[PDB]
RNA sequence: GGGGCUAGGCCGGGGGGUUCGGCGUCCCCUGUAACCGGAAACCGCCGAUAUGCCGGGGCCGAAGCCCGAGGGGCGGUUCCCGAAGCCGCCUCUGUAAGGAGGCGGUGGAGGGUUCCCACCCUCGGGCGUGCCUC
């Protein structure tokens, strides 16, 4: 479903990613001439979204991508702390 | 599609952001990677990630491994916080 | 079952707009490990046998592709109500180049609905499941 809240995005999300990460994909979609932002993690069985206009969230996503990457380039995820 | 090594791919990167500024969607999506080069029928690294970006016409994508994260990982933050400008501001 | 072929198959799919209509260049929603180059709106290739055209290439390989139904699911959409915000008229405030109502607009947060639907899973059909050799 969608989330209002950017941390019960984030933590959720986390927690598909790692459930099975190689099922899960993260897309993000930017939109310069609206000016809004979306962000999405599924597996296609589960769908996450969370949409914004907020300029605050930018970084707070930059975080979010970087650490998934760092999670997915990991052996186990379950290993990796946060 | 034109798979890049990272430099190419954030230079790329930045080109997409920057035409889709009056009008078009930037697609940026994210997932862990196998290392297949080939279908799955009836050899896999477990150390890579793969990044696609699109504007609907043009595709890029670059696969990034523990080797080259830690240095990717700031450069494609500042790319992100320095394109995606225009929204609100409290 | 092993080694060779070649028939095939995949290299994306939807919606809007526009068209008498089908694709495409445009706008939008969306996938893959996965194409490259060229031309194209009062236009490019077509005619319900239409679901693009021209040129180059890769992979898989008898692989598979097609049709239907069910479930998950994203974006649309039909119709039935409807919240913030704004415009104007008239009350009551009482001096705030303002407030509180009533009324009709404007407006569409969010419900309940109709028909589609990227992407994923299951079941059931259809056509193929070949040749040479060991």
Redesign the pocket.
Same mark, same amino acid.
Request: glycine content about 6%; aromatic content about 6%; hydrophobic content about 20%.
């Given at each position: 479903?969608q989330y209002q809240t950017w941390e019960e995005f984030s933590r959720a999300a986390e927690k598909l990613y790692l459930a099975d990460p190689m099922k899960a994909?993260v897309?993000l979609?930017y939109?310069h001439?609206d000016g809004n932002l979306?962000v999405?993690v599924?597996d296609?069985?589960?769908?996450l979204?969370y949409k914004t206009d907020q300029a605050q969230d930018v970084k707070k996503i930059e975080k979010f991508h970087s650490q998934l990457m760092r999670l997915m380039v990991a052996k186990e995820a379950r290993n990796v702390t946060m | 599609?034109?798979?890049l090594e990272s430099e190419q791919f954030l230079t790329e990167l930045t080109r997409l952001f920057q035409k889709c500024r009056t009008?078009?969607?930037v697609?940026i999506?994210l997932?862990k990677?196998?290392g297949? !080069?080939?279908?799955i029928? *009836?050899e896999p690294a477990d150390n890579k990630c793969?990044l696609?970006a !699109?504007d609907?016409?043009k *595709?890029i994508?670059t696969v990034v491994s523990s080797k080259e994260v830690n240095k990717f990982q700031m450069a494609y933050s500042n790319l992100l916080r320095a394109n995606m400008d225009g929204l609100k501001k409290r």
């Open positions: 479903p994909r897309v979609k939109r001439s979306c999405k599924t296609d069985l589960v769908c979204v | 599609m034109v798979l009008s078009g969607s697609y999506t997932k990677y196998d297949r !080069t080939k279908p029928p *009836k793969l696609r !699109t609907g016409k *595709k994508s």
